Design an enzyme around this catalytic site. Structure first.
Site, PDB file in Angstrom:
ATOM      1  N   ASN A 150       0.794  -1.221   0.000  1.00 38.54           N
ATOM      2  CA  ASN A 150       0.000   0.000   0.000  1.00 38.54           C
ATOM      3  C   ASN A 150       0.835   1.285   0.000  1.00 38.54           C
ATOM      4  O   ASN A 150       0.658   2.129  -0.875  1.00 38.54           O
ATOM      5  CB  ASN A 150      -1.045  -0.002   1.130  1.00 38.54           C
ATOM      6  CG  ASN A 150      -0.442   0.099   2.519  1.00 38.54           C
ATOM      7  OD1 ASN A 150       0.680  -0.369   2.776  1.00 38.54           O
ATOM      8  ND2 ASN A 150      -1.194   0.714   3.435  1.00 38.54           N
TER       9      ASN A 150
ATOM     10  N   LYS B 201      -0.213   8.656   0.913  1.00 37.50           N
ATOM     11  CA  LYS B 201      -1.587   8.187   1.022  1.00 37.50           C
ATOM     12  C   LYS B 201      -2.472   9.362   1.477  1.00 37.50           C
ATOM     13  O   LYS B 201      -2.784   9.490   2.660  1.00 37.50           O
ATOM     14  CB  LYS B 201      -1.640   7.003   1.995  1.00 37.50           C
ATOM     15  CG  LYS B 201      -2.450   5.793   1.518  1.00 37.50           C
ATOM     16  CD  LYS B 201      -1.972   5.234   0.202  1.00 37.50           C
ATOM     17  CE  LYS B 201      -2.515   3.831  -0.031  1.00 37.50           C
ATOM     18  NZ  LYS B 201      -3.997   3.741   0.026  1.00 37.50           N
TER      19      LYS B 201
ATOM     20  N   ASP C 178      -1.130  -2.049   6.877  1.00 35.09           N
ATOM     21  CA  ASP C 178      -0.900  -2.584   5.528  1.00 35.09           C
ATOM     22  C   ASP C 178      -2.075  -2.737   4.588  1.00 35.09           C
ATOM     23  O   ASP C 178      -1.893  -3.083   3.434  1.00 35.09           O
ATOM     24  CB  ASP C 178      -0.130  -3.912   5.596  1.00 35.09           C
ATOM     25  CG  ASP C 178       1.068  -3.892   6.578  1.00 35.09           C
ATOM     26  OD1 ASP C 178       1.686  -2.842   6.808  1.00 35.09           O
ATOM     27  OD2 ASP C 178       1.393  -4.949   7.119  1.00 35.09           O
TER      28      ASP C 178
HETATM   29 CL   LIG Z   1      -5.143   7.414   0.238  1.00 36.96          CL
END
Ligand SMILES: [Cl-]
Ligand SMILES: [Cl-]
Ligand SMILES: [Cl-]
Ligand SMILES: [Cl-]
Ligand SMILES: [Cl-]
Ligand SMILES: [Cl-]
Ligand SMILES: [Cl-]
Ligand SMILES: [Cl-]
Ligand SMILES: [Cl-]
Ligand SMILES: [Cl-]
Ligand SMILES: [Cl-]
Ligand SMILES: [Cl-]
Lengths: 268, 258, 260, 260
Positions: free
Chosen positions: A23, A57, A235
């Site tokens: 990720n 992210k 994760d």
């Molecule tokens: Cl994201």
């Protein structure tokens, strides 16, 4: 239409390419370690491989971990490339990031959430790199041609369409296996790949779903696994245990080899 | 929880506020003319009014009109505010836009497609302006609490939740009228408003849908008009009906069913 | 198109009719008691009222209660009609039941799960009675014209379309408030009514949902009530219907506004 | 759990069984010709086969051809069994039909539309025959357990679960490939099969959808054909089945891998 990513041939009637990793980048060491396992398994089985990770992210909670950022992420990607000699894929979030990320990363990814943001699409197009378009959960297979049109108008035709499921009531996704075919037919047979990880909220069914998707004749599979594991929600809740990577991929590859050995049968 | 927007009290048990205007700023005069019509109609009827428009269209085709842009947009909003003496609302797409836009625009709007971009949420939060959160078609009424949490964590609690429909199969939207209640109950009774325009296919159904929504007891109505969008000449006839219903619903105490 | 049910006018631009009652018949006394509460409240407020109940629950589990059955059910309905002088409504499940049920029951109901069963539609049609068509959760508003065409071909045009929500993912219903208008426009403006009860999650939401539906200008409202499938608390019936009526009177007092 | 149907072993880890045939019985001649092709093709390829047909279409418009009916239907089925020595499957719609249909037809089918009709479930269970349960488009995979529980309660455990897609907005179906696994896990690993025909819109997608389904490890495939919107062209049956069998054989050769 096939796309070339270095030595790799990507296409809907070629051996499937694994877009596989984690990720989000955690550190250089964790990255090299996890990548090495993917690289060893993929070499063993003979599966073309591109390492995947986000350096940021941007939807993460305010004071929770969101990655290493653009500078150190690109440094990590440079090392992965130097060490393993493989292509890499990461996602871009602002128009300014595109050119510099495209210098290092071989495939650049348009997040599902930003799939409609024209300036990001244009900026990505201009780089000339191969582009992975994540299909939003709210977009129909036939609405993908509009994103593809937009890229073509911005002068870049090396596009990958990546399925990740569709909204099904509240707090639930379904993967329409018919959608793969509609996207092949309406978007000039560009490579279509399946993001099994993000189509799922839990990992138990990851193999069954992946096999079903690949049975439809696809250019590749997009998959995340645990790294040197960070357990409490670090994760992704559908990530594959890394040690199962070989047992998983051997089955995907056997299925893919079978489907691709049989000529396309038109039902008319 | 009620929110003050200058003289306006916005709340789920207050007279409804109209968030009304157009899709995108095109010219000063066109904006002034259309805004003037809303202002006149709303002041005549006695309905609190906030003028809405976008200054850019970040999702439209390369081959389309994309708006006047920020610099020109803000000038137009300054003129709207000075001439009519009303608040205004616009959307923002990039963190750096928030502070400049928030200097002029009373309410700043988080776009549905950017609903979960943390950097934008933080930048909007930091202005201290009233924020309108567009509810994405793919997020449940419960999932909205998470965006509200982010804003609170970023130091801003002056939030509006704006319904615009939910995905229902391919290329179709349905408005879950129960979701209004769920948002009220789970997000601290923040003001909830209904974007009837972006919930709709055909403009023909706009009154029926707006009345249905407002019957659930809401803080406001969000709609676009044009001289899809309500024809501008029908604004008065349309608002008379909404106001009659809103006044009726709000005159009767909340009947709690238990 | 209006439908007359004894002295009641049912139609999309008439004062709303309440189709109200209970899930299943259990005994004579209990049925009269609950009907009495409805009749008292609706007479007081001035709302046309039709009493609803099933005599059978064909989907219930093997060891669960099913109701009193056809023979005892009709007798209760006869008695309800005799005491209060109101129309009644019940559902039928087999073609053979239609004729005897129709002799007693003013409105007969086609169950959502059987809405496509041609033989059942045909037999209901032949009675000539007023029919309530429960819209299935899996049928679109435009697919209801196919059910209507079927009744028409079998010779009955006294049809009511009854909304109860639509499948929304797994284990959720949503009421598309636009569907009322689509049914009105494509099914010849037959009376459309809203089953707020079988649409619902938890009862707490019944007023908000009922008000939303009626705001779209409808011929009636269909609800069940509980002892006090989340039916309405019986002691709240008056407060509930005051609000429904107030809203329905307001909406109906203003002429239809065409958006163009 | 495996089910024996004559000499056929049906189970989620056995070679897939083909439940194949036609929408509805029209004549004996036409039934025999189509079945002959299925028999020849499945015999040649070595695939267990069960012939499918309905004797009645209870949802068709009134004046559309509805099938030959029960009497003539059972006679046709008797001749199919006599001529080919294969098992057969058909759907039942009323309790009274169950015992006589079960005398002739090896597998009896509960229609999706009648899935929660307790009296029919009970009448079907009492026959002791193998039962195919069609999953309704509006029921979740975990709601299937409730139908299974009813059959178990009424005395029959020889159950098949048949996927045919789920409601996805208006007038659209999607097949959730995760539902197969959920049904296997929550319903005691009963045989699960996939009705590709009823899941579909255009026949062009039949192979891809069918392969996707069978990749998930299933007891069988359920399809209709037609000499030539959704039915497979009869002449493509061999080519089609070669591919299904090749995929099935591969999947079933690999040990189940549980992600842990
Ligand atoms: Cl994201
Ligand atoms: Cl990703
Ligand atoms: Cl998405
Ligand atoms: Cl999941
Ligand atoms: Cl907007
Ligand atoms: Cl836009
Ligand atoms: Cl949205
Ligand atoms: Cl029932
Ligand atoms: Cl239903
Ligand atoms: Cl069937
Ligand atoms: Cl049928
Ligand atoms: Cl169904």
């Amino acid at each position: 239409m096939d796309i070339k990513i270095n030595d790799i041939t990507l296409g809907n009637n070629s051996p499937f390419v694994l877009f596989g990793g984690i990720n989000v980048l955690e550190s250089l060491d964790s990255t090299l370690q996890t990548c090495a396992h993917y690289v060893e398994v993929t070499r063993k089985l003979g599966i073309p491989y591109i390492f995947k990770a986000s350096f940021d992210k941007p939807r993460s909670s305010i004071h929770s971990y969101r990655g290493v950022g653009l500078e150190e992420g690109l440094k990590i990607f440079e090392k992965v490339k130097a060490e393993f000699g493989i292509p890499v894929i990461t996602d871009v979030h602002e128009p300014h990031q595109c050119q510099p990320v495209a210098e290092v990363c071989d495939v650049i990814q348009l997040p599902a959430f930003l799939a409609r943001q024209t300036d990001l699409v244009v900026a990505m197009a201009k780089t000339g790199n191969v582009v992975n378009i994540k299909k939003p959960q709210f977009l129909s297979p036939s609405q993908m041609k509009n994103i593809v049109e937009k890229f073509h108008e911005a002068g870049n035709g090396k596009l990958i369409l990546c399925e990740r499921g569709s909204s099904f009531g509240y707090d639930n996704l379904v993967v329409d296996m018919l959608g793969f075919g509609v996207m092949k037919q309406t978007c000039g047979n560009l490579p279509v790949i399946f993001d099994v990880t993000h189509s799922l909220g839990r990992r138990a069914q990851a193999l069954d779903l992946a096999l079903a998707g690949m049975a439809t004749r696809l250019a590749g599979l997009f998959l995340e696994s645990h790294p040197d594991p960070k357990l409490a929600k670090c994760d992704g809740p559908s990530a594959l245990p890394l040690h199962l990577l070989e047992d998983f991929l051997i089955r995907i590859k056997a299925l893919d080899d079978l489907i691709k050995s049989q000529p396309i049968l038109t039902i008319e």
